[model samples]
Target: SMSYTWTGALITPCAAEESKLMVYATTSRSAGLRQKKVTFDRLQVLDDHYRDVLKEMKAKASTVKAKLLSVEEACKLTPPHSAKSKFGYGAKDVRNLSSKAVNHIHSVWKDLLEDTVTPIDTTIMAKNEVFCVGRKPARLIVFPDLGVRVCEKMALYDVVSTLPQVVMGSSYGFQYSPGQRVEFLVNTWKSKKNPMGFSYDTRCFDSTVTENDIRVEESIYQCCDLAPEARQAIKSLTERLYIGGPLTNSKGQNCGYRRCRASGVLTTSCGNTLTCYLKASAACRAAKLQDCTMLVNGDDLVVICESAGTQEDAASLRVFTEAMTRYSAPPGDPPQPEYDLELITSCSSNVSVAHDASGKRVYYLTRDPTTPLARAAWETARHTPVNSWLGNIIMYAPTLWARMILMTHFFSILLAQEQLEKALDCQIYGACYSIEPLDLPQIIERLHGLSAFSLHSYSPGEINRVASCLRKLGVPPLRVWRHRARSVRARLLSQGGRAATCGKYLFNWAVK
Candidate 1:
């Protein structure tokens, strides 16, 4: 009936002493039926960077005069036409250029990226009716920030869009040191099949050990945090498994046990096998350990520990690694790896996985790579005080757009030159437009000479909002024409004329 009964409540081995620093462990969910580990590296954190960039642009563009223009005006201003910013240039300056020249100016703004030289291309999957001519081309607005601003890389009409997801204080700042040792630990409790299922709460936090209880002195221990010594201690003990919060029994003892039931979180005493399952799940989720292999399929937060392994040690390590994969990158276009999310099973793991080629799995979903912002969050989240009870900060990451299609007849392709240029330049968006296919390859050249470059990213929710905006602006069905025809036909029919013959007999009917 005991959840973490093996360790009495009298003492928390991990947090025995209050020294210069404190570390708090957190939990992550996965999609497996079991628990697993996930890692977020610096690059993975970069996912958030582009997302932030998107937001920054939107925030900056909110006051621009560009918003006053109608959709038609905006499109007409593109390549081959004169270009103008909100107040940067007057109508005369734009008019001085030929339509072609003006269009080229707008194309530069749309196709050229601020930070990188690469040209991104995006496709719209909503609807594709090539036979339907004279229709306006659909555009996707990639915000890559909190969905506030539109990405210059995206054509006025495209299917894919990015939004901003990062903010000023939130993004982990610049990394001063590389290979910093970050630790993740959890206080695991068992999940009991009680009315409360399995949960650890404030009641668990307030509980105190009694003399008559199982008599375990809840003592605190202080450990040295100096390098090599401190680092070795973390890697050996807390690193094996993530940690959870507090647990208390009915008698206010640290037997670390709770009642077993279903419908809700059980607060009574641990009792049956179902209780054990609940206890385990609670421990996994609370302690930041893998909840259970059985429940891993739905938890997107999980990043490691997939298949069932015979040993609990191996299994736990897997779950921890999976959590590392959930981290996102910092602000900018096209996410970059920032945090080195991983389970430091051993000093060898301090390096990356050996002979592992699953870049697709670990890079995007399995374990998050390093990003400056995410790395900052990781360091801060870990150091958060356990007593403070601050929960995990839900972070939103933005994605990048590769290409944009302007309606059907017009298309813009992002090339390598654009990507390279954006990365090199700190300013100046490097978008270009060309009707020729040959012009598609590496047109932006390098961003080294560019200035005022910026980057952005977005979350699915923000991206959905952009999609919603697009939907609002999207062309309605051809019902407008059908309605007009029907109105005229109805009046003709009212005069006893056949609706089908109304168009041909209109002249005679009018005279009569």
Candidate 2:
């Protein structure tokens, strides 16, 4: 399938288009931008192992029974600012389940079941992002209308959310909390006699979709015992919307046609994950990688296995990439073997070691803070809706960088505003939760254990990378951050309530 067939029309924005951006703080070149791998088992060798893994995966998927969601449930799931439908209704209308919106949704679902060949319309627009200096602004997003999005939930949300864990089990990475993910990795690494790991990256992963991939994913969805209408809807959607569709600009003009994966679809991540694991597992066997354990979250993958010497392992990874290339997932960069778990980045995170107050070693997931910090700066200097730093804090709660930077910056600001008690929305694993700054101590403790508040003796690489991020962002160094955190902790301690709890826990390291 082709990635896009364009009509020479500009992808007009629904709102006024502006690429006006910030002056970045970093003098540093792009991180990991340097000169940027992989064996020889045959493809024909993947008979019993491959077929049986696929067979059992389907058997488990078949056991799940996906029920159709009520229109109200679907409505409630809609994001408030979701794109408007071309059918004279918008997100708010659907969210409130207005008569017109409900009727349109029903009509859309009805149309979905009855039609199979008519292409769905998608809106394409620039992502309106803030990348670092000298980066290009070419990323565009493609998404269906609000009405179909709701219809999707009504038909398939249950299967998408429920079937992944059932079929993929622990390998289904989305099912893991950040802390759980770290533990799984640590245990997996420690168990191996010679732990070898690498993260596989599929170049332009979404655009790598072929018609067969969509059909295979649909087959997996249908493996579940879905309600008849729901099953039919899924089938029809697969044949129509999910297979590919026409792209419209925000101005409603014909901008292009897409036969590739739509980034905003509900099945986007689910499909990518299943296919990634499926292809990677097959590739692993074809390469003869031993004792492989796979973790697939969307198209992001991490595979840990026993190393066959550095030279042998490197050759096998090349074979793995060759197998995956034949299967349609060419790596963005060639996969390289990493014996150190901390060096193997997947899902934009890696496991690192830190020491707590009791002097016991601890493991946590962390990533470079440059992007999060830069985005935080953007959100701070302007009025952006998403509070990415809060999500980062929640998702990476155990990290010293989160404690030192995210909490210190935001809590201090919120403290000065006397807004510490105010709850703000943040997403963890794509679900919204409202969190108050005052309750952060309890939140951190629950999510990352109380030791998150007491972690010290961060590994040299972790600390060096973190402080480098601070310096790169032109954000103050850790010393200045520590001083502010000290003041913030004491002031909260003086408040003697939830803030006191926050003070005692969040700044436990700060005080020390």
Candidate 3:
């Protein structure tokens, strides 16, 4: 009903005065908008342009038909410190070819193929609340044991990597850096006569997936040249596991059965990608939006299309919503168009104002300061599956939050431990990367462009949000960061080589 409802739990750590931070909770829609009840009433009317796009997309999806990987290659080891198997296997052991782990995975695969699947046991974790102004309630990550997870990878990893980009060209994502992403946005904005663009968010995207949707996905896969066994395994997996797994809580209650997509499978990536593209492509045709180019990453959909005037655009969006509603992917937030490039957001990232070299107004990627600051505090205190601090530093290295707070705090800690050379893993565009302080300059330059070194002015809004996040996370303020940064910068320069370069580029702001 409401956009958000306030509930229990503090945005900050529990010891902090909880009332100072307000937590906003949204209703979990699985109970209300279950997938089977969703119906697609309208068919998309395809023009030549729409058909061409769809044909090209189908052609890309078809290429994967000729390629298939062996089971061992598909189920390759994840990092040792990756989330441990809930089925009583260690990540390291699973990676090491543990007989027990392999046997269990084989059994899981066989069970899935033979229609012997029991409800997949799942464990739920509260995801980090790194966005929004106030305390947002923890997002839930519900997933199955290590064996089932690995099996999922075996079935769909290749499809996830190759298919989406093939279907969505410049909008493929994973193909561009944040700077490049913004460049594409700006160029798209300037390219058209009256270009109007908007982003669409699917409400509880994974949860809204129905059994029929899973079957539809399976039929799409059947179009590929998957091995007979591979096809059977994938089909059974989709039916028994992907459509819905039983969600079990820590207290070990029979948490009933799941009839929607599970957030924790390899198919989660591929499934969402295929399904969203399918819906939006059809919706674009149904709404008669001219030359609608889409960039969808999972449930994040951004459309750049020829403007049809404000009144017409709103009506088109309503038509698009109806198409999506009929298709079962309801909008969490209604779609609205912005003529301005900076205002259009996808992937929770928006374009923000900063100054590049020569004091030129530069637009780059940024989200709220919440996650970066919260992560900086976490990284300052201990290690995590993702070094959000490092990832943010690499992507938003030029931003006030990344340069002033994240890089400064992390380097200070690494320098204190005399571990500046120690490599830590972080992600960019869904790929895992390792970064040490020594790599900052190259990473900053590549991802943020050369402006990362010289970007000076940041929006007051970004600065204030960073300050608020630091206060909320109980991290030291900017003054303390500046003090620590001076020492870190000095030490980096002393090390010489790339370290010196890093000091010059990343720490130059501190000297300024």
Candidate 4:
């Protein structure tokens, strides 16, 4: 029907039955910082693949005609009658069209097909699901020396220089497409030491609007304007947004706060790992029904806040997996293609998986949501309307010099203390810690000051012991040193850490 066509490499299994295949590559306009543009490039590129295929078919029209009949006959054949044709023009003959016309037709077709759809050229695609990975940097104050002497507080700017890159890269693999029928499948792993798992969160936006206006709806989905109350309720309940909103127990009863259960743990010897498997099953079902839908694996992209990686980083994976698998899909639907899983555990610093499988586009966490809890305790935090912090702060940093030091050198100390205290039948519940040490009074005083950042539940002796053990274990004492700086307190410059408060503040001491 059309004149000429173009095509791209087709991956067989990657395409579904009776479906098509296409591939594309790209470079960042501004260093790949804009996910919306990235997603638009992907979608437009894919659509072009289909168009290119059609163009290629048009280009071969002559050969096809030759095979169907002799060239002379092909040209001499009468044009097919068309009721839509004008009286003077009986019909249009493919062979009769000039070579230039065919080329022109091909170009026009490309424009017609692609031009009809608006080129996605925004900075917020995938439901504004676009996010950078890594952890948030915060100014953390730790009593490295006890209350008598406060080691300078650390932030992302302080110690994010030494984190393992591949770890962050691997975490980036979880994001997918936007406005499609898909859900991310993530598997939360139990801590290598602690049997329980941890909690993490993923981002979502309504397919319709940007700059979520509460008057319009509670979240981004409300802006999409296509989802019904029932549909929205289903999404909320299944996705764990509201307790008792929709997703129910195995018995089908609402399960939110009353049943908001979570698990995971950290270890001194080994860090945990998380694996994510995404399924296109639900997205596919919604698409087949021609309903307002989501995309499978491709559109449902995940963004890890560029902050820390901790047991929470590893454990939050569990909640992600559970949500994608159980909540993301339709209430009751059969599975489909695009259902797969991925794992990233380099945070423990021992292994690597390229994650370069076909039909799968793997990336690393470049940005994360900006939230208060996600920042440091000392920094001014943004509180939710409910007066609770939405994000959380953990002990991993990818960019800050100090946060990196804290995780690498000081993490073991905290982990060892956590394990020892927990083993002692002590329960440091609800983001709060509790333990005993010989110098209880001094520890409390220092802890009171340190409490502005990290929760102090143990005594100074315990803190010192942990630091000492770590030092004996070969960790740099300067990295985790407490007690005032032995020498002059060199003024530390603010590099870049999570700062919800009054911009950038510095720790006046340089330990390592």
Estimated TM-score for each candidate? 0.15, 0.92, 0.80, 0.19
Q: Candidate 1 overall Cα lDDT vs. reference?
A: 0.22
Give the candidate number with the greatest TM-score.
Answer: 2
State the C-alpha lDDT per candidate.
0.22, 0.80, 0.69, 0.22
* lDDT score for residue 476 of model 4: 48
Residue 3 in model 2: lDDT: 63
Q: Evaluate model 2: give its TM-score.
A: 0.92
- Residue pairs in clash, model 2: 38-317, 38-318, 39-315, 39-316, 39-319
lDDT of 1 by residue, 192-262 (tens): 11111111111111011111111100000011112332223222211111121223222334423211111
Per-residue lDDT of 500 in model 3? 80
**lDDT of each residue in 187-228, candidate 2, tens digit only:** 999999999999998876777777777887898899998888
Model 1, position 509, has a per-residue lDDT of 18
Candidate 4 residue lDDT tens string, 1-512: 11101121111111121110111111122212322211110000112322333333223321211011222232233223211111122224333644443344344333323333321110110111111124211111101011000000010101111111122223322232210101221221111121221112222111111111111112212222222422333233213321111122222222211111111101000111111111222222222221111211212233212112344434443333433433222211222212112222111111111122232322221111122212222122221112111111121111122222322222233233443123111112123223322222233234222222222232333235445544544444544333222121221112112211101111222243
Residue 113 error, candidate 4, Å:
5.4
- Displacement of residue 341 (Cα, Å) in model 3 is 0.7
Residue-pair clashes per candidate: 212, 5, 2, 77
Off by over 4 Å in 3: 1-59, 82-88, 116-121, 124-135, 353-363, 381-383, 416-419, 425-434, 456-488, 494-498
